[PDB]
Structure 1
Amino acid sequence: VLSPADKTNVKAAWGKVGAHAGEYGAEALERMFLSFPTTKTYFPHFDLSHGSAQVKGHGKKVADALTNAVAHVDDMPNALSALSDLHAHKLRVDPVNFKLLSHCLLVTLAAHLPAEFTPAVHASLDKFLASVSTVLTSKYR
């Protein structure tokens, strides 16, 4: 559950991603696939090579989905219902993988947004990604 301060922090920090959405999302995926190779099993027919245009395109989708989540942060299950059906119902992604990607998103934001990534904002971003993860791993239709 996010505090009012958490929502403020996330909106501010994620708001700085902007046109770097695809870039940051792609970097987070690449970090996940490299650091935690079991996660590649969910993408059996992807080009997961370094600099892959397919991962860059997928990075933009993930980042845009996080933008969607921020714009609906008080009502996320209804805003992400399509993504929940995909990840929980269709793909059956083990919840541990969301912790791995969330960590890699934090690493990416830490590496690109040093002024923004204070301990407080770090905490709020972690909670936000955990909330998003809970929604995407739940079946609630």
Structure 2
Amino acid sequence: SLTKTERTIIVSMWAKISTQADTIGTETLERLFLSHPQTKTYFPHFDLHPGSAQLRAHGSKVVAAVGDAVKSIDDIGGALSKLSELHAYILRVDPVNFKLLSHCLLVTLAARFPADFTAEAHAAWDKFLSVVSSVLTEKYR
């Protein structure tokens, strides 16, 4: 869970993200796949070249799920249980990969909303994305 000053920065930054959700998703994944190409091993049949329709479509879903976490921020694990089964049991994504994606979303947010991306906002988002990542990750791995 997060604190008041944190939950409110999350909710408040989300308002800004929502109107550019599609491009934030796409950019987050392009940064990820180009900076840490080994993460592509989890998408063997996807075309993950920059600009691809498939990468773009996936980026929209990822940011939309972050939205689900923000909506049910008081109970993220509850809201993401199906996605959690998908990422833990089904796909067995190694925990390290979530850190790589989270960092790329922070990079994207910092470049997109420089004024709202204070050290304090950066801290609340790093913490929020760590909660999201733990939820999606196979416990104890």
TM over 0.5: yes
Task: Give the corresponding residue for 1:18.
Answer: 18
Task: Give the corresponding residue for 1:120.
Answer: 120
1:1-141 to structure 2, matched below 5 A, reads: 1-138=1-138
- Using the alignment, how far apart are the partners of 1:14 and 1:114 within structure 2? 14
Amino acid at match of 1:52: S
3-state SS, counterpart of residue 129 of structure 2: helix
Task: Let me know the Cα RMSD of the aligned residues.
Answer: 0.9
Where do 4+ consecutive residues of structure 1 move more than 2 Å?
Answer: none
Q: Please give the TM-score of this superposition, normalised by the length of structure 1.
A: 0.96
- Using the alignment, how far apart are the partners of 1:6 and 1:48 within structure 2? 33
Q: CA deviation at 1:3?
A: 1.0
3-state SS, counterpart of residue 74 of structure 1: helix
Does the CA-based 8 Å contact 2:69-2:80 persist in structure 1?
yes
Amino acid at match of 1:22: D
Q: CA deviation at 1:19?
A: 2.8
Q: CA deviation at 1:94?
A: 0.2
Can you give the 5+ residue segments of structure 1 that lack an aligned partner in the other structure?
none
- Using the alignment, how far apart are the partners of 1:103 and 1:44 within structure 2? 23
- Using the alignment, how far apart are the partners of 1:35 and 1:63 within structure 2? 19
Q: CA deviation at 1:138?
A: 3.5
Amino acid at match of 1:3: T
Amino acid at match of 2:124: S
**Range moving further from structure 2, 125-134 or 3-12:** 3-12
Identity of aligned residues (%): 59
Can you give the 5+ residue segments of structure 2 that lack an aligned partner in the other structure?
none
Does the CA-based 8 Å contact 2:92-2:138 persist in structure 1?
no
**Range moving further from structure 2, 12-21 or 38-47:** 12-21
3-state SS, counterpart of residue 17 of structure 1: helix
